[PDB]
Amino acid sequence: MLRTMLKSKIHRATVTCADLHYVG
Amino acid sequence: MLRTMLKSKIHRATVTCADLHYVG
Amino acid sequence: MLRTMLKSKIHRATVTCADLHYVG
Amino acid sequence: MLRTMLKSKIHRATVTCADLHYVG
Amino acid sequence: XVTIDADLMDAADLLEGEQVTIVDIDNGARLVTYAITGERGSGVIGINGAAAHLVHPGDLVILIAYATMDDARARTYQPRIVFVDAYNKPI
Amino acid sequence: XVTIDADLMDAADLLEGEQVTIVDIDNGARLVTYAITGERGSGVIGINGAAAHLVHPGDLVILIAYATMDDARARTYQPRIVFVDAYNKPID
Amino acid sequence: XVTIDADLMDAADLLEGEQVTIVDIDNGARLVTYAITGERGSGVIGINGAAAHLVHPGDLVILIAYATMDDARARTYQPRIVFVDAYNKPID
Amino acid sequence: XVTIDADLMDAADLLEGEQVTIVDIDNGARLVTYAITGERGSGVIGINGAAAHLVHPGDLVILIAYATMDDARARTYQPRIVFVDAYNKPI
Helix, strand or coil, X not given: CEEEEEEEEEEXXXXXXXXXXXXX | XXXXXXXXXXXXXXXXXXXXXXXX | CEEEEEEEEXXXXXXXXXXXXXXX | CEEEEEEEEEXXXXXXXXXXXXXX | XXXXXXXXXXXXXXXXXXXXXXXXXXXXXXXXXXXXXXXXXXXXXXXEHHHHHCCCCCCEXXXXXXXXXXXXXXXXXXXXXXXXXXXXXXX | XCEEEHHHHHHHCCCCCEEEEEEECCCCCEEEEECEEEXXXXXXXXXXXXXXXXXXXXCEEEEEEEEEEEHXXXXXXXXXXXXXXXXXXXXX | XCEEEHHHHHHHCCCCCEEEEEEECCCCCEEEEECEEECXXXXXXXXXXXXXXXXXXXXXXXXXXXXXXXXXXXXXXXXXXXXXXXXXXXXX | XCEEEHHHHHHHCCCCCEXXXXXXXXXXXXXXXXXXXXXXXXXXXXXXXXXXXXXXXXXXXXXXXXXXXXXXXXCCCCCEEEEECCCCCEC
16 A cells, blocks of 8 residues: 655746747 | 555545645 | 556446535 | 656647547 | 446446546546545436545546556556446446 | 544554545645645644645545555455544534 | 657657657646557657647647656666657657 | 756755755645756756746755765755845855
């Protein structure tokens, strides 16, 4: 029996940039 | 072959508070 | 390495009833 | 401890058709 | 949650409490819930609790279950696909 | 996230950091977050952070956790289902 | 659901019935469905059923599959990432 | 997708291609994507592709990864929690 558990959290980071048409 | 099954349910609990800007 | 695979599908069933305030 | 990882990505494909009432 | 006719659950290989995805053909809603066994041969597809906001009586729905399986089994696995009439009886 | 009274977590077999689905009976919102242990017997159900946009004080919610289990165990497993009064205390 | 050209399924290491996330670059829709094998080399990306409400012909989409794997394998696993031209043919 | 400063990925124990949930404190958006390694020490949190519709530059976000683990390990596991300044540098 497997549970899904929180392992990682970056708390209240600020989004610096965004690209709708990113290739990668 | 593994199935995804209900293990826990808290039925019709009442939300007591909400904080948009929680840190923790 | 585990994949998530379709195992079950009920195709184009008709919803017969709904209860917002169901207890069970 | 198992991680959920990207295994497959088809990047920027063009949707060729859509059928609301598909049977299959 | 979703109450399913025990006949459809057997036909589709669903257990009580198995996670189920409901997709609504009428309004495009998509949600995740779990299967509850409904009165056998009644053709019941019952939306219970919060889901009733999104999926409504009279709507055509597709009910989907997924499984986690090792690479080897995934390549050979045959899913159980259940077609139903307008009265939710298997074909 | 969601702060849950330790009594409800024990009753429901939820761990701190276990993934939880919240569904809102009042507005139909559905989100995935994780359980935080709340003051025992306080009846706290606390929405923290981004979730507060979707789930509001006084809303009736269902909290759900799922597990992956082998076919054999899935057929025999008994899920822990906790009914509560208006004060978030367990009931029979 | 989503009908995918068998060439793209092989290129991306997707099986018929494998769970797939579709994200729509045009309208920001995000849904989970499964892969159906489409006519090989046809460049078909076919939205079937309820998904057609959210994802429309001519939309640019990203199709994603995830796998659960042990820590050791996760650090070394190379995901199969398939870039395509306007006609849904694989590219270098 | 989401481009994350390699320092935050190391701090949070995230691999390139690991599934990540983004929750937006500003607009309440919630989505699932995967981590891409960003220029180390740049403080980059970059939203790429379809996600850019929902999560915007300047927004405060929480990035979350989950793991599947056996009952025994789940009861003892300690998650990696990374606090950051306004410039996305760990504390």
